[PDB]
Design a protein around this ligand. Structure first.
Ligand SMILES: O=[N+]([O-])c1ccc(O)cc1[N+](=O)[O-]
Ligand SMILES: O=[N+]([O-])c1ccc(O)cc1[N+](=O)[O-]
Lengths: 117, 115
């Protein structure tokens, strides 16, 4: 996939997050993808584990905003906000992508000190 | 190493960059570290190659400023500016058990350069 494709995929990830659609999120990930959210916690491996992880977003209506996004090589680094309610999280994320454009890995860098309001 | 010590290493690195100290930069990296700057370009592998990469900073004076830094596990993600021009960069470093930098990746393009 191209960097443009991967940027597009990030935008659809953020769409499905904002809509509370874990099935649509999980479908963006590769069968053997990894999710580390937050970085430092035990990695979730494979689509089944990833779908379970995202299950709590079911039927949650949130908003997202991309502050900056850099799609380079097979990777996308993006700095973005997630607003639920409420509370606004300030997140640095990195995703990497397989040859078929599905997400191979995601890492999210934030703590409660990046949550406001 | 602890996240607090890795955060410290990032601060040391950014000052060695600001001051133009490539040998001191190289010393912060592990002997088999990797540098990918920018992401998408050929990786620089091993401290000797990394020292050569940074060689253009020798005695070059710049300014660096951290916007936000998150030290988590054995990683640090940081959003920062390098300054004429100013570059806003997203960087990720990972660290070995002994606190040396195992890997660095820098995410920026000329679109992130403003007057
Ligand atoms: O912690 N979080 O809420 C979070 C952080 C980064 C993400 O890519 C997604 C989520 N989420 O599950 O909504
Ligand atoms: O733009 N650059 O060359 C750059 C980007 C990220 C860095 O951590 C350091 C440098 N530098 O040594 O100047």
């Amino acid at each position: 996939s191209t960097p443009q494709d991967n940027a597009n995929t990030v935008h659809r990830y953020l769409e499905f997050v904002a809509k509370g659609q874990p099935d649509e999120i999980a479908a963006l990930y590769a069968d053997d993808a990894t999710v580390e959210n937050p970085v430092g916690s035990e990695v979730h491996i494979g689509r089944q584990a990833i779908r379970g992880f995202y299950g709590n977003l079911e039927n949650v209506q949130s908003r997202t905003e991309v502050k900056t996004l850099r799609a380079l090589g097979h990777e996308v680094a993006f700095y973005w906000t997630l607003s639920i309610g409420g509370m606004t999280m300030d997140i640095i994320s990195v995703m990497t992508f397989n040859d078929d454009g599905r997400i191979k890995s995601m890492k999210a860098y934030w703590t409660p000190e990046n949550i406001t309001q």
